[PDB]
Amino acid sequence: GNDYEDRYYRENMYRYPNQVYYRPVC
């Protein structure tokens, strides 16, 4: 979880994926 991306306007509906986990570390 060292990698991430805090940006995508977090509203609720289809406005952003997540980008909060240990996946972008691959």
UniProtKB/Swiss-Prot annotation:
Subunit-structure text: Monomer and homodimer. Has a tendency to aggregate into amyloid fibrils containing a cross-beta spine, formed by a steric zipper of superposed beta-strands. Soluble oligomers may represent an intermediate stage on the path to fibril formation. Copper binding may promote oligomerization. Interacts with GRB2, APP, ERI3/PRNPIP and SYN1. Mislocalized cytosolically exposed PrP interacts with MGRN1; this interaction alters MGRN1 subcellular location and causes lysosomal enlargement. Interacts with KIAA1191.
Q: Which gene encodes it?
A: PRNP
Please give the clinical condition linked to this protein. Answer: Found in high quantity in the brain of humans and animals infected with degenerative neurological diseases such as kuru, Creutzfeldt-Jakob disease (CJD), Gerstmann-Straussler syndrome (GSS), scrapie, bovine spongiform encephalopathy (BSE), transmissible mink encephalopathy (TME), etc.
Record's protein name: Major prion protein
> Which compartment or compartments is the protein found in?
Cell membrane; Golgi apparatus
What family is it from?
Answer: Belongs to the prion family.
Q: Any other noteworthy remark? A: This protein is produced by a bicistronic gene which also produces the major prion protein/PRNP from an overlapping reading frame. The alternative prion protein/AltPrP (AC F7VJQ3) and PRNP have no apparent direct functional relation since a mutation that removes the start codon of the AltPrP has no apparent effect on the biology of PRNP. In mouse and hamster, the alternative initiation AUG codon is absent and is replaced by a GUG codon.
**Domain remarks:** The normal, monomeric form has a mainly alpha-helical structure. The disease-associated, protease-resistant form forms amyloid fibrils containing a cross-beta spine, formed by a steric zipper of superposed beta-strands. Disease mutations may favor intermolecular contacts via short beta strands, and may thereby trigger oligomerization. Contains an N-terminal region composed of octamer repeats. At low copper concentrations, the sidechains of His residues from three or four repeats contribute to the binding of a single copper ion. Alternatively, a copper ion can be bound by interaction with the sidechain and backbone amide nitrogen of a single His residue. The observed copper binding stoichiometry suggests that two repeat regions cooperate to stabilize the binding of a single copper ion. At higher copper concentrations, each octamer can bind one copper ion by interactions with the His sidechain and Gly backbone atoms.
Organism expressing this protein natively: Ovis aries (Sheep)
State the protein's purpose. Answer: Its primary physiological function is unclear. Has cytoprotective activity against internal or environmental stresses. May play a role in neuronal development and synaptic plasticity. May be required for neuronal myelin sheath maintenance. May play a role in iron uptake and iron homeostasis. Soluble oligomers are toxic to cultured neuroblastoma cells and induce apoptosis (in vitro). Association with GPC1 (via its heparan sulfate chains) targets PRNP to lipid rafts. Also provides Cu(2+) or Zn(2+) for the ascorbate-mediated GPC1 deaminase degradation of its heparan sulfate side chains.
- Part of the full-length chain shown: 145 to 169 of 256
Q: Superkingdom of this entry's organism?
A: Eukaryota
